[PDB]
Structures are given as C-alpha cells and as structure tokens.
C-alpha cells in the first residue's frame, strides 16, 4: 500500500433493510494531528461527506486501538446501498490527504 493510506473494510458489506451497517476505517496516525472523513460516492462520481472522527444516522466512533474506527449507519435503507470510502487529513508535520479504496454497500 503506497503512502500508507487508510483502509475501509469490508469491501462488500451486505445488510438487510432496517438493521445497521458498520464499515471500519483503519488509520495509524504517525502525525497525531489528523481528521477522518467518511464519504459516500455517487455513481455521478461525486463525493459527499457523512461524518468525521472529530464529530444523524451516520456515526464515526473511535475504537480502543486508536488505529481502527467504526463507521455505522443506523436504520439502513434500500436507497443507502452504494459505494463508500474514508480519507485521512493530516495537518502536521506534513499537510496531506490519504483516502482508502472504495467499498460497496447493499
């Protein structure tokens, strides 16, 4: 993985309607000065933000290891099926954005 970017698992999350859908974004913070973003990714190829690690049906909750994050959609719907991704925005010592590969929801 070039540039050490965050990950986004599972690649294909399948959930029935009604129950929750939880992706998990993994970002090991070398910098300790970072902000996560959680995107939905329209077939128009447009990128809309849904929540963040520095914080609605969309939650970003930090897990104990500090490298893994949960990204939960409560009361999921059929019109929530799509492609998602997360991106890490480091501010210091190096200003950068590193974004995971897209994962699908059904």
């Amino acid at each position: 993985r070039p540039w050490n970017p965050p990950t986004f698992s599972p690649a294909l999350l399948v959930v029935t309607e009604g129950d929750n859908a939880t992706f998990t974004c993994s970002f090991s913070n070398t910098s300790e000065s970072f902000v996560l973003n959680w995107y939905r990714m329209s077939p128009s190829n447009q990128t809309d933000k849904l929540a963040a690690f520095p914080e609605s049906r969309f939650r970003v909750t930090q897990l104990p290891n500090g490298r893994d994050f949960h990204m939960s959609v409560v009361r999921a719907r059929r019109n929530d099926s799509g492609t998602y991704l997360c991106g890490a925005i480091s501010l210091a010592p190096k200003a950068q954005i590193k974004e995971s590969l897209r994962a699908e929801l059904r």
Partner: antibody
Amino acid sequence: EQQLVESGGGVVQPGRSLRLSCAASGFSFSSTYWICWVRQAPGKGLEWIACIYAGSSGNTYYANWAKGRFTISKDSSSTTVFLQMNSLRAEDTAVYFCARAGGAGGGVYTLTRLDLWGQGTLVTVSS
Amino acid sequence: AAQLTQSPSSLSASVGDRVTITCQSSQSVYNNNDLAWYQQKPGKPPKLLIYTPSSLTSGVPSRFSGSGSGTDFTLTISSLQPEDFATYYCLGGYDDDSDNAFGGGTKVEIKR
C-alpha cells in the same frame, strides 16, 4: 462554480507593507482544503509563498524564504484568505496568484496539488 | 533547503514529436513521488497537468505522462499537439512543506 479572485494589488513603496485578499466562491472552507499563494515576477518562474488550512485548526505553512516577512490568514466571517506582505522590496514586484489544494475523491492530496487557480493580481514595489 | 533543477531550459519541437522534460531535486521528495507538473501559457494562471502520487480526473489529455521516483522525475508528451507549446513547471514537496518549491520552468517552443 469554484473560483478564486485575488485583489488588493497595485503600487507599494519599498519598505512599506501590503495586504492581498483572495475571495473564494462556489465552495465552502471544508475540512479538505488548503488555500495557497504563488507569485511570479515578470518573465521569471513560479514561486510558492505560503498556504493556510481552511477549517477550524487553520494551520499555516510558509516557504523558508518567506518566513518572517509574509503572513497568511483567513477571514472568520466569510470565505477569504489574506497575505500580509511586510517590508516589501523591488524583488517582490510580481503577479500574486492564490491557489487551492485538497478535496475528496482524488486519492492523495498534498500542497503540491494546486488544481484551482485565480487570475492573479499585480503588485509593483516601487517609489 | 531543497532546490529543483529543470532540464532543459527550453526546447524547440515540432507538432507530433515526443518531448521529455526532466526535473531533479537536491533531496528526495515526500514519499518519493510528491511532485506535480504544471503548464502555463503567457498571461494565464498555471494549470496542473500531472500529480505523480495519483491519477487525475481533471480532463488532462492522456498524451501527458509523469514518471520517476525519489529525486529524478520526467514529464513526457507522446504526441506534441499545437495546444501544448507553453512553459512547464515542476513542483516538489518534502517532509517539511517549508521546503516546497517550483522548478525553473521549461519553455517548449515551436520548431520552424
């Protein structure tokens, strides 16, 4: 549509200061964007000056030659970025662009990825 | 304290040629590819052609290509079209964004 408009250029006298403004429109100062300043002396090449992080933390990034003589900041009530240019000298006579880096969906972003540019404003340091 | 050296200073080429501009950094750029190539035309703001770390959706023509790692980078134009005669600048970033700087520029002119 996305746009950056520089303003505040013109004549300035050697030793005096000048503040430039970059009026952004069509987008918000989200968590994914940096506003930068690049200048170009007549006939010479591009020279990176400084960037400021749009969003809460407002981190500043300066070029070594510009540290101590330039100050970048943003307006809190609007979507504007300023460049305070102190102790100006003839070598500073240049066109000053403001550019933008960052976004979402392009994989990796650094301050070397300036994909939105204004038309630049001319500053003439002379008495 | 990085310096980016662009070779050659200028080159004269004909439409349809294959040109190669190079950019060499005194110190390695961040993660060995934090370098971007920009195109500028007289009176005009610059435009980002290649970002070495990621492929672009801007609509940059495919004939433009970036290559290289560490300190030596190359911009290649497979089939030079009339709309390409301009000046090309490389921009390198480092571990400290204070070291970021542009190259000297390569002015690509028409051969007649």
